[PDB]
Amino acid sequence: KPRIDMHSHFFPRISEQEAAKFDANHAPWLQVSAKGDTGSIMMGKNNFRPVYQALWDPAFRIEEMDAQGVDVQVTCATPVMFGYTWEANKAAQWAERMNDFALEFAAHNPQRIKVLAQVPLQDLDLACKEASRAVAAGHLGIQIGNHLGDKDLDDATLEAFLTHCANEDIPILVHPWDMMGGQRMKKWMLPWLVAMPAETQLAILSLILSGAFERIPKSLKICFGHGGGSFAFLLGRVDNAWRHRDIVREDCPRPPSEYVDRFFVDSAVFNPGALELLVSVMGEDRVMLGSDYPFPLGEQKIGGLVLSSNLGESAKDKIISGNASKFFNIN
Amino acid sequence: KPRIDMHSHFFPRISEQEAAKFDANHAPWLQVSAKGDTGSIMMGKNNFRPVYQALWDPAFRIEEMDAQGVDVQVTCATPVMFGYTWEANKAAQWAERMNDFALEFAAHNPQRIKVLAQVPLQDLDLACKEASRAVAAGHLGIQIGNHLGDKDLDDATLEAFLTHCANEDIPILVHPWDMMGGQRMKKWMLPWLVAMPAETQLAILSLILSGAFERIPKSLKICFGHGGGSFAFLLGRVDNAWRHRDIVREDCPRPPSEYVDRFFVDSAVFNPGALELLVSVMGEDRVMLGSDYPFPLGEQKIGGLVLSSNLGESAKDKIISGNASKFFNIN
Numbered sequence: 001k002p003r004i005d006m007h008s009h010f011f012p013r014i015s016e017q018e019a020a021k022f023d024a025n026h027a028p029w030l031q032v033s034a035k036g037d038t039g040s041i042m043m044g045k046n047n048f049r050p051v052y053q054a055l056w057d058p059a060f061r062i063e064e065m066d067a068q069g070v071d072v073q074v075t076c077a078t079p080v081m082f083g084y085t086w087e088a089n090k091a092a093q094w095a096e097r098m099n100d101f102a103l104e105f106a107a108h109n110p111q112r113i114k115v116l117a118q119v120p121l122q123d124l125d126l127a128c129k130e131a132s133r134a135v136a137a138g139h140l141g142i143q144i145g146n147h148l149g150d151k152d153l154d155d156a157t158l159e160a161f162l163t164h165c166a167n168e169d170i171p172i173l174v175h176p177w178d179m180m181g182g183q184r185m186k187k188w189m190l191p192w193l194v195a196m197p198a199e200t201q202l203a204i205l206s207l208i209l210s211g212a213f214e215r216i217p218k219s220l221k222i223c224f225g226h227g228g229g230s231f232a233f234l235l236g237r238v239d240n241a242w243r244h245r246d247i248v249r250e251d252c253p254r255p256p257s258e259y260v261d262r263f264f265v266d267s268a269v270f271n272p273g274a275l276e277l278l279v280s281v282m283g284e285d286r287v288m289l290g291s292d293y294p295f296p297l298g299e300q301k302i303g304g305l306v307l308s309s310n311l312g313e314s315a316k317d318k319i320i321s322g323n324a325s326k327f328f329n330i331n
Numbered sequence: 332k333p334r335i336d337m338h339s340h341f342f343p344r345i346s347e348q349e350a351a352k353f354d355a356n357h358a359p360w361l362q363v364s365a366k367g368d369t370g371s372i373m374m375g376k377n378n379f380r381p382v383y384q385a386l387w388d389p390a391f392r393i394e395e396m397d398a399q400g401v402d403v404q405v406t407c408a409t410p411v412m413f414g415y416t417w418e419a420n421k422a423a424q425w426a427e428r429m430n431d432f433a434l435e436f437a438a439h440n441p442q443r444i445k446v447l448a449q450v451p452l453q454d455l456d457l458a459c460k461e462a463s464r465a466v467a468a469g470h471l472g473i474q475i476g477n478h479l480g481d482k483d484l485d486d487a488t489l490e491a492f493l494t495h496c497a498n499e500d501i502p503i504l505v506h507p508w509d510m511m512g513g514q515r516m517k518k519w520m521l522p523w524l525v526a527m528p529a530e531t532q533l534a535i536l537s538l539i540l541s542g543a544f545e546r547i548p549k550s551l552k553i554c555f556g557h558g559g560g561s562f563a564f565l566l567g568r569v570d571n572a573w574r575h576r577d578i579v580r581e582d583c584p585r586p587p588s589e590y591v592d593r594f595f596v597d598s599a600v601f602n603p604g605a606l607e608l609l610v611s612v613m614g615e616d617r618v619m620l621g622s623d624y625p626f627p628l629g630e631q632k633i634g635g636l637v638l639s640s641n642l643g644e645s646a647k648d649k650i651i652s653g654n655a656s657k658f659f660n661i662n
């Protein structure tokens with residue numbers, strides 16, 4: 001019974017240039033002190049997010065994992081690195097460099113630090129090419145943002161990407177990014193509190209109600225972050241609309257709630273009643289412990305909510321380790 | 332045990348000429364078909380939306396209330412009537428006209444049909460004086476939309492309006508409308524399944540995280556539709572951000588979940604487990620039966636989810652009737 005944290009992020013140790021050989025204004029880089037504990041992600045010479053040392057330092061992170069009791073942590077790019085709005089070839093070179101950084105990071109201890117890759121998702125060919133390349137090099141899967149502008153997961157290019165990954169047994173973690181709401185949610189981190197769970201819910205519903213799950217091979221292993229946003233709580237309203245409105249059944253021939261056997265979520269819902277509902281909707285085999293480490297909006301005592309819950313011990317063990325080791329092929 | 336449905340809408344018998352008194356191009360009017368069972372909302376000469384008889388005909392609505400077992404229904408404007416983007420004086424005159432149409436609609440059976448008023452929310456002084464005028468004239472409260480373009484409920488103008496209504500014991504219903512993310516949600520009722528719960532959550536959180544609930548007198552009676560949207564499920568994630576980031580705390584001087592004593596929600600969450608969670612979060616005193624009627628009835632039952640639940644019979648009575656009688660002052 002290891003403990004696997006399958007939701008965490010890292011940021012590479014990349015110079016101001018290097019980073020400017022791709023873009024001054026938009027390719028991010030890492031500015032670090034001599035004090036060492038402190039650093040910032042820089043865009044050009046702007047700032048952006050001060051960052052904790054465990055975001056970039058694998059040795060420092062291993063100490064934190066020991067204190068938290070985490071045996072293995074899956075980690076992957078922070079969304080600022082995605083580069084989805086870039087010229088496709090530049091973005092594919094970026095992705096390759098980023099995925100090499102990730103393996104370098106995990107090389108500090110590959111038995112305990114696993115990595116997921118990013119892909120140049122705005123170009124299907126380059127995206128599939130990089131997915132297979134990165135997995136052949138030791139990534140256990142791919143992490144993508146959930147949409148490309150107005151194209152959600154039901155978009156043909158995105159469905160085709162999931163189908164490539166399914167056909168090569170490449171697991172997918174879907175992360176919300178580029179949040180809806182435009183000019184509205186500008187204070188108190190409302191984007192993270194409102195738009196992000198809606199982004200994830202939209203991604204799941206897009207796959208379900210478009211019939212995408214009818215087209216995508218059952219072999220796809222896909223997991224959505226942050227418990228799947230509000231998906232589980234709003235499922236009853238979805239199922240009701242499907243039963244009583246033929247326009248909700250136009251492309252989806254089964255009740256939406258039956259498609260929970262096609263994806264996974266992590267457990268980061270931050271509430272005991274929420275977790276129980278979530279497990280009740282997804283089943284104990286489809287929730288995996290994830291923490292959003294090392295970000296402040298993550299779970300501070302990793303696995304605290306699952307271990308202190310009232311679920312059976314078989315359930316707890318699946319969530320903290322059994323499911324993710326099967327999902328990602330970890331021993 | 333008067334079964335009360337406190338969440339429903341209507342649209343009046345507005346002729347083209349009546350609407351041309353305000354805006355020949357943008358004031359909506361109702362073109363009832365010659366057969367009388369369907370109609371169109373119109374703007375000028377253009378067809379805007381097809382509508383069903385129950386929307387405009389109070390006598391037919393009584394028929395459906397009887398079939399459904401609803402003894403009293405609270406109704407108020409459908410959002411196309413709001414007029415928030417209009418010049419302020421025109422919008423105030425329109426609001427008074429609409430609020431008169433509502434009283435005329437309720438006059439068909441005022442024991443069983445109660446109404447709430449609309450206000451020209453784009454002008455503080457005009458909005459509060461119409462609020463007082465309409466409540467004196469017989470309205471039991473106000474229904475506002477949840478946002479005015481990019482201005483959410485934390486906007487000073489809107490906070491001030493709620494304070495006015497708190498101070499005069501004018502209850503308030505918040506109806507989500509003009510949904511975010513529209514260019515992405517054009518099939519399968521996604522605006523109502525995804526954007527609408529988010530809109531409601533955003534409205535609750537904008538009052539909390541801005542500290543508006545701290546400055547708004549506790550006398551305010553305010554209710555959010557559709558169970559509060561995803562608010563109750565995502566509250567843990569909100570608390571775990573308030574704990575851990577200063578900027579989530581800058582204007583909210585207590586943990587967000589402590590404000591669940593400051594508002595109400597209707598019971599529309601379409602799922603027993605989701606309802607239990609909702610009552611667990613809000614308490615049996617702050618959930619009110621509300622259906623968003625008119626909708627095609629079919630096999631569905633207003634209040635069926637609540638009555639068939641496992642809550643205390645005492646709790647059901649509060650949800651079915653007790654809470655709305657106290658909230659709106661009905662006997």
Ligand SMILES: O=C(O)c1cc(-c2ccc(F)cc2F)ccc1O
Nearest residue numbers: 049078079080081295296297298576
């Ligand atoms: O505490 C914060 O400010 C915070 C920040 C992030 C975050 C940081 C950097 C980045 F490129 C993207 C992010 F979502 C993610 C979560 C979070 O809580």
Ligand SMILES: [Zn+2]
Nearest residue numbers: 009175225292
């Ligand atoms: Zn994350």
